[PDB]
A paper describes a structure:
To gain insight into caspase activity and regulation in coral, we expressed and characterized two caspases each from two species of Caribbean reef-building corals, Orbicella faveolata and Porites astreoides. Two proteins referred to as PaCasp7a and OfCasp3a based on sequences similarity to human caspases contain CARD motifs at the N terminus, an unusual combination that has not been observed in caspases-3 or -7 enzymes from higher eukaryotes, and indeed these proteins function as initiator caspases. Our functional characterization suggests that PaCasp7a and OfCasp3a may function similarly to caspase-2 because they exhibit DXXDase activity and contain an N-terminal CARD motif. We also report the first X-ray crystal structure of a coral caspase, that of PaCasp7a determined at 1.57 Å resolution, which reveals an N-terminal peptide bound near the active site that may serve as a regulatory exosite.
We attempted to crystalize all four of the coral caspases, and we were successful in obtaining diffraction quality crystals of PaCasp7a with an inhibitor (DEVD-CHO) bound in the active site. The crystals diffracted in the P212121 space group, and we determined the structure to high resolution at 1.57 Å. The data show that the PaCasp7a is very similar to human caspases, with a root mean square deviation of <1 Å compared with HsCasp3. In the active site, the carboxylate group of the P4 aspartate hydrogen bonds to Asn315 (CP-162) on active site loop 3 (L3), the backbone amide of Arg356 (GP9-02) on L4, and through water–hydrogen bonds to Trp321 (CP-168) (on L3) as well as the backbone carbonyl of Arg356 (GP9-02) (on L4). In general, the active site provides hydrophilic binding pockets for the P3 glutamate and P4 aspartate of the substrate, and a more hydrophobic binding pocket for the P2 valine side chain, similarly to that of HsCasp3. The structure of PaCasp7a with inhibitor bound shows that the insertion extends the loop compared with HsCasp3 and results in an “RYP” motif in L1 near the catalytic histidine. The structure of PaCasp7a also reveals a peptide bound on the protein surface near α-helices 1 and 4. The structure shows that amino acids in the N terminus of PaCasp7a (N′-AKLFSFGG-C′) (N′-PD-A025 to PD-G018-C′ in the common position numbering) compose the peptide, where the two phenylalanine side chains bind in a hydrophobic pocket between helices 1 and 4. The binding pocket on the protein is formed by five hydrophobic residues on the two helices (Leu187 (CP-031), Ala190 (CP-034), Leu191 (CP-035), Phe330 (CP-177), Ala334 (CP-181)) as well as Phe381 and Phe382 (CP-217 and CP-218) at the C terminus.
Author numbering: 384 to 387
C-alpha cells in the first residue's frame, strides 16, 4: 500500500 502506497499513496498517490
Amino acid at each position: 500500500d502506497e499513496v498517490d
